[PDB]
């Protein structure tokens, strides 16, 4: 939840005492009302104050839902639609203030899920707005997938939204992640098709040459490297692309010699091409990588040992 602030200081300590009493009396009353079975708009009022400042007070979200449910039975569909539209406005004012609260996002999904005519395009537009403010807001990305499902939005449309998100700025981990789940849906086998993979390789390689410090594209690139054929199954095209990637990373390594991502990728590319043929260079690359990225020396030694082992198995396989 909240964490944290840095460590006239009486008018700050005064106002805190003042807000507590309003919070305290309001909370008191909502509970009194609730125990009294008073499921009315006074509870919606009382809770709107508290939830705006504490959207993690889950029991109050629950109270709202009880009020809303009860009222829906005893109100015309015109009075019910009005209470609903007020609730959408309330939710949005809450999210503008704290866009990372489980409670508020869940209440919105609960709300939208039970509406007779939900306006999903409007909800997707809400997501677009929140994702411009914070393109790593996983609550919002999750709400966006929920909406997309509800509106039976096609993976290709979400794939286009991810492309527009990637070229236009950094903070792309969330967007690459979404692509990793979208692409397999477009090509749905019980390991992406080569043509698609090769295209994704092109797109990710652009990203990490555009910004070599963008870790998200390097992490996605490593998945792409595994998500394919095999080294004695390399097409001339894949072989050529991966070779071209290797030289391009070495070019990068010339420019950014402290860039650990490009070094690790060179090793993984060589593995992907020919473990034994590239054995000496791989070992050379480990020593360099470990000097560049010492916090990871333990990881890197374990990876190298895994690879040395695989190389022993490949040499034994010799006819």
């Amino acid at each position: 939840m909240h964490g944290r602030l840095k460590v006239q200081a009486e008018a700050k300590r005064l106002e805190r005492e003042q807000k507590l009493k309003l919070y305290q009396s309001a909370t008191q009353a909502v509970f009194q009302k609730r125990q009294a079975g008073e499921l009315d708009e006074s509870v919606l009022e009382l809770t709107s104050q508290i939830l705006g400042a504490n959207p993690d007070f889950a029991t109050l979200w629950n109270c709202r839902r009880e009020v809303l449910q009860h009222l829906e039975t005893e109100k015309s569909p015109e009075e019910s639609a009005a209470l609903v539209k007020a609730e959408l406005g309330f939710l949005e004012s809450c999210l503008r203030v704290n866009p990372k609260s489980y409670g508020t996002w869940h209440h919105r999904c609960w709300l939208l899920s039970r509406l007779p005519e939900p306006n999903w395009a409007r909800e997707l537009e809400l997501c677009a707005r929140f994702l411009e403010a914070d393109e790593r807001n996983f609550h919002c990305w999750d709400y966006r997938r929920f909406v997309a499902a509800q509106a039976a939005v096609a993976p290709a449309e979400e794939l286009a939204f991810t492309d527009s998100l990637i070229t236009r700025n950094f903070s792309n981990y969330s967007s690459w992640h979404y692509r990793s789940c979208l692409l397999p849906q477009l090509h749905p086998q019980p390991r992406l098709p080569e043509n698609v993979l090769l295209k994704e390789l092109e797109l990710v390689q652009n990203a990490f040459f555009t910004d070599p410090n963008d870790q998200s594209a390097w992490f996605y690139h490593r998945w792409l490297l595994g998500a394919g054929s095999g080294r004695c199954e390399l097409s001339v095209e894949k072989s050529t692309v991966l070779q071209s990637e290797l030289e391009s990373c070495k070019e990068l390594q010339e420019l950014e010699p402290e860039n650990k991502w490009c070094l690790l990728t060179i090793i993984l590319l060589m593995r992907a091409l020919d473990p034994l043929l590239y054995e000496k260079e791989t070992l050379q690359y480990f020593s360099t990588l470990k000097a560049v990225d010492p916090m990871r020396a333990a990881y890197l030694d374990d990876l190298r040992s895994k690879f040395l082992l695989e190389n022993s198995v490949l040499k034994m396989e010799y006819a």
């Binding site: 993690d56 007070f57 629950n62 997938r145 789940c181 916090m295």
Partner: protein, 325 residues
């Protein structure tokens, strides 16, 4: 690239006696305290757990908390964060964790806790947090963590529970809230804990996830919860505990992490902050201490990376998940 720089007068020694005092006294009005009523049960779990790890549990009020816990169990069997608040899996776990530290599980109706948890499982094996239907692998963890401490894991559909959690496994080796959600430290902790408890760690790509987790360590030595975020004591606990569960704790620099966590201590007030120079809280104090324990601190009791409770409590109740090593 985002990171903190540790100021050179930062604390570099373990202020155990100060943390004991900070927690011993916590909840004696107070702003954040009254405002945190909606999570009281878990606050109580954080305080008691950290005290017990420092050998200081006796300084807390057993009798008083036992009464409090009992009055938080509702008629459906679930437990609320506080008296009058609504029952939820999160506080059901916390309560069961407290009663386990105290060896007083029959202070509540265990048959009804089990029935409550069992009721929250959905057809796909997922768990809702409460009757209002929020689905999150956090709740999959809370459910089995709760049932394991009670010896009632068999009460739920475990295979479907497993299937749902693995369906939240992502391209990077990590796990999300729900199918298609992005990986992050807190979620990975919940799901790796879940798989420890259900004996499924063989289904984790330990090397791949291990790497994603060790890449959380920033030059300052603190760990972040995901790429392009700041380091933090809570994220650090989740990541390190996850690494231990999958047998790859050695993949981070332990001495640099130790220094980050020690530097998040308040020399004056005791307790730990989320990062150095911020204000302490009991949440980050549990995790600071638990993290240091996992890093090998001999003054702190050994802590379970799955249950975030002292191993000796778990040994006593006989719940000790095999890890990956």
């Amino acid at each position: 690239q985002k990171d903190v720089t540790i100021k050179s007068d930062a604390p570099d020694t373990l202020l155990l006696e100060k943390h004991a005092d900070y927690i011993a006294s916590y909840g004696s009005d107070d702003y954040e305290y009254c405002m945190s009523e909606y999570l009281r049960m878990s606050g109580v779990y954080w305080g008691l757990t950290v005290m017990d790890l420092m050998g200081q549990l006796h300084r807390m009020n057993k009798e008083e908390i036992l009464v409090f816990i009992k009055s938080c169990q509702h008629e459906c069997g679930g437990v609320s964060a506080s008296i009058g608040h609504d029952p939820h899996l999160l506080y059901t776990l916390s309560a069961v964790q407290i009663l386990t530290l105290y060896d007083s599980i029959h202070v509540i109706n265990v048959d009804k806790v089990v029935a409550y948890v069992q009721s929250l499982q959905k057809e796909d094996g997922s768990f809702a947090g409460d009757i209002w239907g929020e689905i999150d692998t956090r709740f999959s963890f809370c459910a089995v963590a709760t049932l394991a401490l009670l010896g009632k894991l068999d009460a739920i559909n475990v295979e479907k529970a497993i299937e749902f959690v693995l369906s939240c496994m992502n391209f990077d080796g990590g796990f999300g809230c729900r199918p298609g959600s992005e990986s992050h430290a807190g979620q990975i902790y919940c799901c790796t804990g879940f798989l420890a408890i259900t004996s499924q760690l063989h289904q984790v790509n330990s090397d791949l996830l291990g790497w994603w987790l060790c890449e959380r360590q920033l030059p300052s030595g603190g760990l972040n919860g995901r790429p392009e975020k700041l380091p933090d004591v809570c994220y650090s606990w989740w990541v390190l505990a996850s690494l231990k569960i999958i047998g790859r704790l050695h993949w981070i620099d332990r001495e640099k992490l130790r220094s980050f966590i020690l530097a998040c201590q308040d020399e004056e007030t005791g307790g730990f902050a989320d990062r150095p120079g911020d204000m302490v809280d009991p949440f980050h104090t549990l995790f600071g201490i638990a993290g240091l324990s996992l890093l090998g601190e001999e003054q702190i009791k050994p802590v379970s990376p799955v249950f975030c409770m002292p191993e000796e409590v778990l040994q006593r109740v006989n719940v000790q998940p095999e890890l990956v090593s």
